[PDB]
Amino acid sequence: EILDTHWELWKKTHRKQYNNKVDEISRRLIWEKNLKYISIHNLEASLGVHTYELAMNHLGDMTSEEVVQKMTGLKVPLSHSRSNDTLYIPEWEGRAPDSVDYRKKGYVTPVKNQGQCGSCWAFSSVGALEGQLKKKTGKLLNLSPQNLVDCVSENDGCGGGYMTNAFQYVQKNRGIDSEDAYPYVGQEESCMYNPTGKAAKCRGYREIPEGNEKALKRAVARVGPVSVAIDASLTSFQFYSKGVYYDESCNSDNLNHAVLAVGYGIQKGNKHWIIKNSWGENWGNKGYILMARNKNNACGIANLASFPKM
Length: 310
Prior knowledge:
Blueprint (H helix, E strand, L loop, with lengths): L2 H11 L7 H27 L4 E3 L9 H7 L49 H18 L7 H5 L14 H9 L32 E3 L5 H11 L2 E5 L4 H4 L1 E4 L13 E11 L2 E7 L11 E4 L14 E3 L2
Antiparallel strand pairs: 1-4, 2-8, 3-5, 5-6, 6-7
């Protein structure tokens, strides 16, 4: 009931300003809605209606359609399907483990905050484009998603874009800078790539078969981090916190987010997919979210995946 005092706490805790009480008391009202949702959901879990738990994050004030409007970025491109093309990837008749995590392997890097910009496409590519720089150079550094943002003329930069276009670019341009020499700002600028700061390179990419969650599983185990696309326009997704994630409402045709599969595995009876995100370290479980695996292609986890070849 003392929500009055707390909202302030949750306010100060973050960078909540709200200049002019106009929107102030408004966002706070929405806060109560979400907070309300969490309460219910987390109760339906204790009973066993769901298999995951939710909690408040720096996105309490915002709303579902909002984030899906200013913190996504995916831009499903034109046709490409073939299943025998040049960039297609047909795993070889070998064997795949039972569970892998590319974090314990130091193949992944800390999570960042794309911010209020459709930099998901760049943050997603700048992730797999990293896991390789480790699996070939042995040294893992943090590339720059900004680089692509204001350089990949074929992508709406802060306005939207795809991944197979970044891999293509980073390559065709002869190299991608490094966040250490081109800092992300989250606003769209002028391509100021500095060759004198090459961090990685590309020689092509590969599109994982369409739908094959099995192909997704082997690719990650044989190649490493894999840039994937998903449907992140659900309240359950936005307030995730722990446990495997599965909402029977996620759509396989509404792809609006691009994340990174840092491996897979099973947990407490349910399989899963370990995914790194770009919504700050506060979101979910320190930045990653366990997404149901081998469960009818939830949120289209294996609908539009791909990775670069260093």
